[PDB]
Design a protein around this nucleic acid. Structure first.
Lengths: 100, 100, 136, 215, 126, 82
RNA sequence: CUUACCUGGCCUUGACAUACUAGAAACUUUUCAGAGAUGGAUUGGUGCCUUCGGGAACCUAGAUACAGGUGCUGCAUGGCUGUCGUCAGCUCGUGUCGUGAGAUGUUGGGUUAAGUCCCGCAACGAGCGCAACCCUUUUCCUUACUUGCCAGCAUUUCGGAUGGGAACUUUAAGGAUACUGCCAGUGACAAACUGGAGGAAGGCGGGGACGACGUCAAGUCAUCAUGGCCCUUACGGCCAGGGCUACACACGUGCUACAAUGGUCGGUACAAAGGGUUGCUACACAGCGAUGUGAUGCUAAUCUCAAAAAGCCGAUCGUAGUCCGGAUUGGAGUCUGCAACUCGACUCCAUGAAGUCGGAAUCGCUAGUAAUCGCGGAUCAGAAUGCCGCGGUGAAUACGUUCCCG
């Protein structure tokens, strides 16, 4: 009863789905059943920044940043699956957490 | 800001870091129920006898580039002017103009 | 506006009597979005008039409305039909507000019955409009 | 009135960010401050090497700095000593091992930063500003851009009253979000003060959106 | 048997329609227990009273989100969609009554420099 | 007010001075800048020169003053009318 | 503290840089005087490379080029911003007319949110502006099935709680759809305009971002950078206390009320978005309460802040300065913090001010808007009636351009 949990975090959804698709494709090639990827709710943070150097309270820029999360489950893992997962490259801008 | 103010901030940070451990020890001893009332009382006296700059409440957040004491935005560590300039140049990963 | 003609906003019929007149009266009574309180006030008065004379609530209300309806404003000119009803409801709520009784519903029913015999501040204001129209 | 930053307004539309890494909220500030220090240090050191773009990445507990330059030989060094020294200083500043990579620009006249740097150098060498502007605009248009606008502001020629002069050939559709517009700003420090230089270059409209751009 | 989904002001209602005596439960509650004000009860019942079919169907309803008015509107929309799915010939009558339209009105966001969506702070020439 | 579980607050340098005077019997006013110190029962009968931002004003401690801060008897702002 | 101001106490190549000369690991313990800055004694350690004759940081001593300045000039400047104003205009090349500066095109007739589009016309052609490309919301499809969901089956302590299911809601990536597409009438017969069907949506469906050529010697030398002028035992640097919180007055922007469409008490329903490891805390005990103690889960679609409030049902108050209002003051406390006197927030008991809907005048708003009700965040040890967001309930009126403003 060994299950592998993969969590992906990023600031760029196109990157995060590219990485998730690559991981899923590799796992399917190795010969293990996978579940996902499952999109978790996105986090959004906003800021209001005054633009003028001295006094204009109504002159502000509104910025935002988003955090995207993906969840992937691997069930019935073959022996080659794990070593393939550490052989898999790490792309900048996407953070990966693996739990056994 | 001025070099004197920046150096003052640096000195206060150094003092807080130096005295961090003993302050926590004395506070835990004061909170200790099993310890005697006398133990707690001399612990409180020693805490009051510690130097003033050892207290974290005297630290003020300043911009990491200019030293400005207003508009700090803990998440980036920069004041509003530098945050605007750098975000609009594109050196902050993930931050974009917000509309909804 | 200046260039366009804006259509009037159609209001839904009252879900209990299917009466746009009753719905408009409820909207005139309602304050700051409290529709439930206005519904209670209007329905209580409609039931009270039904008990104190066994008449249909809708018909009795239309007849009283036509009695308290003006015919002219003020320069004399003929008031369009919608403004007639809008002005009659305002008079009927304003004058009903000033009576002394336990609840707004009872005051509304009481002055509806009073106006059905032509006795009320709303009808007096109507006669005032008649006089000042004779003035012009 | 005032105009929005051409790169900032397109940072998520047709443009890529200059920093590509992820960090938790605790480490975000430290990472950003070290990145800014790295950028300032590199800008100071490579002043005469024709460097326009610096891209910083943090793939896995390490750093990768890509420098876009028109003087790859000068940047690299005689035998590669300069790149290894640069790696040492960058690792020292950043606290993690760092890899420097070089991307060579083959069309320098289509880079907004290099044109502004050249114009500012000429202004500091006190050539007449209208000649400098016309020469730069003609050179870029011959190079093959579809439009370029150049603006200079300040005490032009040493006059006691500052003013602003601009010059444009071609097409510059600033309100089109899908247009590819490079923008640059620079300072010329003359005996009579600061002169500001701004350059816009238009290189055609990008089609397919950010899906095509492959963020 | 038949299924419908209704939406109104961030409220979503799932409606399951069958043939039966006329039982109606909302979130394992009766209509009078769930809705306190009479108009909310009338809005829910409007489609069946219009069709004169108050007695031939059984309803199983769940609903989440929004307030009482939004939930009543969502339930009405879901019942209408369930009836349409059960019989396509009923669509003209319900469309004429106006029940098939999804009301897309929604709360407008607050805007920078304003107290509300449109309300502006008080201003003075003097 | 300060929480009762912590007790009253007195500056150590002022406490040492008053304790030394009471162990002795010196009537010399105690010069201090500690406007924040609490007046204790040992203070009664003593003269304390409290700083008020510009000067040192003398205060003679009586029984009724116990439980107050030293600064309440040294006003810091000057006002006589408009 | 911030702090740039005042009183008093101190330092002088300086709190910080480079360049030169010598000596030391750096660091570390314990005290004494002092309001502190500081000054004096007092311990341990004395380290890392080495072609090892010295070097790497780091500290101390001397010397002078210098540092330092939130000092002045926004009327010397860069950069950044407001405003007219989301106003609809601003230009260029060939050809014609004029001695010429110039004109024409860009005018004239309809129309539009728009120099938006169509006609005529010594004109024929182009760029920046408008519109579209970007984000969000409304209908449907595909992929994805956990921490989220529960239609059918089974077990249930009746709690999706448990097997289980991939239907539905939702979550979030990619797509489809709306284009005067169809019909009728009009306008010129064009641009268009009006009415009808279907459709979730019909003529720009709703909202956001995006602000042309230019004006105001508009604002900022106190974010920053920078020409010039000024100080150098002080206009620089360190410290304790005070002030920025004053108070016969005037003005601007707000909050709470003057009550019955209400106040109080008991019972009982329905959200969205956002935050949480120096943090948020289930539950139990103690307290009238703010809170305290023990303890549990959570690095979070998993645990938590968290009680939504207005709403509905029942009782009572009966028009009174009141069972309205909640200022002010007296007395007890809690928490953060080295420290709540000047000068914090909150809790309990007592007190119970003006206020009876407010002159001349003046402001905002055309639909999920106004009005009203609650909830969250940035800043932040603590300290919002401000600011930036989120949802609940949910109106009235537009005949028209005669006058007011632009």
């Amino acid at each position: 009863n060994q299950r592998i949990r993969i969590r992906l975090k990023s600031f760029d959804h196109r990157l995060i789905d590219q990485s998730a698709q690559e991981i899923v494709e590799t796992a399917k090639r190795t010969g293990a059943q996978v579940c996902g990827p499952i999109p978790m709710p996105t986090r959004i943070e906003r800021f209001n920044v005054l633009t003028s150097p001295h006094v204009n309270k109504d002159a502000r820029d509104q910025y935002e940043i988003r955090t995207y999360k993906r969840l992937i489950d691997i069930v019935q893992p073959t022996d080659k699956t794990v070593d393939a997962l550490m052989k898999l490259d790490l792309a900048a801008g996407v953070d990966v957490q693996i739990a056994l | 800001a001025k070099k004197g103010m920046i150096n003052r901030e640096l000195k206060r940070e150094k003092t807080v870091a130096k005295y961090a451990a003993k302050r926590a020890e004395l506070k835990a001893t004061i909170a200790n129920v099993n310890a005697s009332d006398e133990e707690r009382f001399e612990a409180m006296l020693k805490l009051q006898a510690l130097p003033r700059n050892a207290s974290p409440v005297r630290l003020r957040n300043r911009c990491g580039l200019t030293g400005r004491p207003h508009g700090y935005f803990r998440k980036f560590g920069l004041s509003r002017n530098k945050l605007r300039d750098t975000v609009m140049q594109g050196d902050v990963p993930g931050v974009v103009k917000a509309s909804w | 506006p200046r260039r366009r003609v804006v259509a009037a906003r159609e209001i839904l019929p009252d879900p209990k009597f299917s009466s746009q007149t009753i719905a408009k009266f409820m909207n005139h009574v309602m304050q700051d979005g409290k529709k439930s309180i206005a519904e209670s006030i209007v329905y209580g008065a409609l039931e009270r008039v039904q008990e104190k004379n066994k008449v249909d609530p809708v018909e009795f209300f239309e007849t009283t409305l036509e009695k308290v309806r003006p015919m002219v404003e003020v320069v004399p000119m003929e008031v369009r039909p919608s403004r007639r009803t809008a002005l009659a409801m305002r008079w009927l709520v304003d004058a009903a507000a000033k009576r002394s009784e336990k609840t707004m519903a009872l005051r509304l029913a009481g002055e509806l019955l009073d106006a059905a015999e032509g006795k009320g501040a709303a009808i007096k204001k109507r006669e005032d409009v008649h006089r000042m129209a004779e003035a012009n | 009135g005032q105009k929005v930053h051409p790169i900032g307004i397109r940072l998520g539309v047709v443009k890529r960010h200059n920093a590509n890494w992820y960090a938790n909220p605790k480490q975000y500030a430290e990472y950003l401050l070290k990145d800014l220090q790295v950028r300032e240090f590199l800008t100071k050191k490579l002043k005469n090497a024709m460097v326009s773009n610096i891209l910083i990445e943090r793939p896995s507990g390490a750093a990768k700095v890509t420098i876009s330059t028109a003087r790859p030989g000068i940047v690299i060094g005689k035998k590669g000593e300069d790149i290894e020294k640069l790696q040492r200083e960058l690792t020292n500043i950043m606290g993690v091992p760092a890899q420097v990579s070089i991307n060579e620009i083959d069309r320098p006249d289509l880079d907004a930063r290099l044109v502004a740097e050249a114009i500012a150098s000429q202004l500091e060498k006190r050539v007449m500003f209208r000649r400098a502007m016309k020469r730069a605009v003609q050179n870029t248009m011959r190079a093959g851009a579809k439009g370029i606008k150049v603006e200079v502001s300040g005490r032009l020629g040493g006059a006691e009253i500052a003013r602003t002069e601009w010059y444009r050939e071609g097409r510059v559709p600033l309100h089109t979000l899908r247009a590819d517009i490079d923008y640059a700003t620079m300072r010329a420090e003359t005996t009579y003060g600061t002169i500001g230089v701004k350059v816009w270059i238009f290189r055609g409209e990008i089609l397919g959106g950010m899906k095509q751009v492959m963020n | 048997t038949n299924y419908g989904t209704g939406r109104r002001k961030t409220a979503t209602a799932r409606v399951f329609l069958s043939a039966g005596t006329g039982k109606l439960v909302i979130n394992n509650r009766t209509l009078e227990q769930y809705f306190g004000r009479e108009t909310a009860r009338m809005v829910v019942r409007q489609p069946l009273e219009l069709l004169e079919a108050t007695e031939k169907y059984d309803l199983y309803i769940t609903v989440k989100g929004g307030g009482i008015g939004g939930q009543a509107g969502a339930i009405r929309h879901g019942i209408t969609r369930a009836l349409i799915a059960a019989d396509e010939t009923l669509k003209p009558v319900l469309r004429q009554a106006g029940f098939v339209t999804r009301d897309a009105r929604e709360v407008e966001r607050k805007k920078l420099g304003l107290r509300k969506a449109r309300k502006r702070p008080q201003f003075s020439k003097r | 007010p300060r929480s009762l579980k912590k007790g009253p607050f007195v500056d150590a340098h002022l406490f040492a001075k008053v304790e030394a005077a009471v162990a002795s019997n010196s009537r010399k006013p105690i010069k201090t800048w500690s406007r924040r110190s609490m007046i204790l029962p040992d203070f009664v009968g003593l003269t304390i020169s409290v700083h008020n931002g510009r000067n040192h004003v003398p205060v003679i401690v009586t029984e009724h003053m116990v439980g107050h801060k030293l600064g309440e008897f040294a006003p810091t702002r000057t006002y006589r009318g408009h």
